[PDB]
Amino acid sequence: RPTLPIPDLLTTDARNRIQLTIGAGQSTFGGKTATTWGYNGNLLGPAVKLQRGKAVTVDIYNQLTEETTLHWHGLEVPGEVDGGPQGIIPPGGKRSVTLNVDQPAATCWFHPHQHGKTGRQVAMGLAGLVVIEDDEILKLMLPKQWGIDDVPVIVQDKKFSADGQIDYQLDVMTAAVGWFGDTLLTNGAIYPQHAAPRGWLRLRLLNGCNARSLNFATSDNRPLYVIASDGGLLPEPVKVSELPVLMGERFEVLVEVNDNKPFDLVTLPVSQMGMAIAPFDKPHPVMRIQPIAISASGALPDTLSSLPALPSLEGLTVRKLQLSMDPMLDMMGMQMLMEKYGDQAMAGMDFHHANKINGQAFDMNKPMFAAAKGQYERWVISGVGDMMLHPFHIHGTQFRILSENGKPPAAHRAGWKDTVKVEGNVSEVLVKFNHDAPKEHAYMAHCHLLEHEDTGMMLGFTV
Ligand SMILES: [Ca+2]
Ligand SMILES: [Cu+2]
Ligand SMILES: [Cu+2]
Ligand SMILES: [Cu+2]
Incomplete structure (x- = not known):
């Protein structure tokens, strides 16, 4: 490799x-x-x-x-x-x-x-x-030690044409379900190996896919210790055996490395339309970790940082963001997906302005509202009405998730985030904007399934 x-x-x-x-x-x-x-x-x-x-x-x-x-x-x-x-x-x-x-x-x-x-x-x-x-x-x-025991891991899929070129298309199908491919890349390489010293290995994981959600684990089920999310450190490590990561999200994890036992970081099949088509119907290797029999210096601290209490909800401004997809796009896109790939595409379950927030496809010339500066607000984002996955990203902030898709957030998702899962249910986040954004350079709030963003599922707001 x-x-x-x-x-x-x-x-x-x-x-x-x-x-x-x-x-x-x-x-x-x-x-x-x-x-x-x-x-x-x-x-x-x-x-x-x-x-x-x-x-x-x-x-x-x-x-x-x-x-x-x-x-x-x-x-x-x-x-x-x-x-x-x-x-x-x-x-x-x-x-x-x-x-x-x-x-x-x-x-x-x-x-x-x-x-x-x-x-x-x-x-x-x-x-x-x-x-x-x-x-x-x-x-x-x-x-x-960057590139030794502290390593970035940018995981992305691509589709290639027979000639070897990247085969990208924004069409009715991808506007509905996203662009996804059959080839997985890790910092641009196919199934690479990384030699890591004995002890702790820190992985800075980024899901850099356009549309594919991932779920990281190890080939021998050794645990991952989550130490950080999008916006930084958790208060204490959170031990997990599986780590779902949405498009655009980061998590930093520590994993143990020992001498006589190489292992893979892998991604497990997800329940998202289109994403469990072979080879992603089974666990898929991401990279091989090759132990090098010299002792590393890093530690897994019991206490990482101080996480402040959620502020009081009483009296905060509530903003509602209803995501939607034109029923015609939803139907036609799903039909094209089914026709191409068949039942496996549903395992576990003008289009250019057909995706919307609050009934409006993105209009760069009209910010939907002005948010307060330096004041917490409660933003409620809903995906009720379709079955697609919408990792919702808000610019200019690191927020706290109050509720994620109708459930309290998992411990490793309860710290600082810039993305929140929205999929057929409703999420609520506590957001604060410390910096200006005028109409000429507004902040965006949008789905980070990129083909949804590109076909209207975005709004501008000022501060
Ligand atoms: Ca301890
Ligand atoms: Cu982004
Ligand atoms: Cu979306
Ligand atoms: Cu953005």
Whole structure:
């Protein structure tokens, strides 16, 4: 197996700047070359390293031949630098943003947010990571050797055509159920191996799929100890044997590594339309962990951080967000899925403006409301009325889940999150926006099943 590719850990240079170049290149998958897009390279991107309380300026050079944007997913930053669909970078052009990091340590990420084309641009290869550090986390003595015992794991599926090229399409079927493929990539590689020292191995997991939810486990059922979610550390580790991860979510886990026993990280079949078609009808390897018989230094702390109480709900503004899909899209898309793949597509269970929030397909020129600045609000998001999975992402914040799809959140999902599951039921989150977003650079709230976002399931809001 190839070694697990490790994204470069990109820190500020001598001028306090970071340079990112967006461009087209080539990669090889299964011995066949494909055109791919990357940040500072051919595919995917680096891990931008930030410190809480320190400003960095990022210079972003778009060397593609089409318009793009760069969204810092999970970052609590003003709308002007949030990189939603209004954050246009012309082809051949450059935009610079200053990030004033004002949140605790976390693994965030970055990716395009081009109006109507986010799915395609992510599918072509664009995604990178953000590693935010603070004083608190560094005192913990967690595994911290990047690319050795502290490793990012960006898991993505792709569909390829017979010629080896990426086969992306936004059509009636994918507008309904998402773009998904039969090939799983781990930091861009097919089933790579990672050599890790004996002791604890820290994995920063990102589901970077357009539409496919994942469920991580190990091949011998050794536990995963969840230490962090989208917005940073949990108060204490949460031991799990399976870890569902929705599109765009991150979790950091520690797993034990010992000398005479290699094992795989795997993903288990999920109950989501289209996602259990072979080879995903069975557990699927993600990467092989190869023990190297030298002792690692990292620890699993009993206590990771302090998690504040949920604030009082009394008197908070409640905003209702009803997700919906045009019944015609729902029917036609499901029918196309069934016709192509048959019953296995349901195991365990103009389209361009057919997905909606509050009866409205995304209109970039009309923010749906103004949210308060510096005040907790209660947002209620419903997927009642269809059977699709909607991981709902709200920009400009890290929130607390009060209820997730009609149930209290699982312990490892009860900390800081920027995504919440919505699937045929109702979720409620406690959100606060500390930064401005004017109408010209509004925050987005949207489904992170990218083809839903691209066909209308998004709203803009100002702060
Ligand atoms: Ca202990
Ligand atoms: Cu995102
Ligand atoms: Cu959706
Ligand atoms: Cu977004």
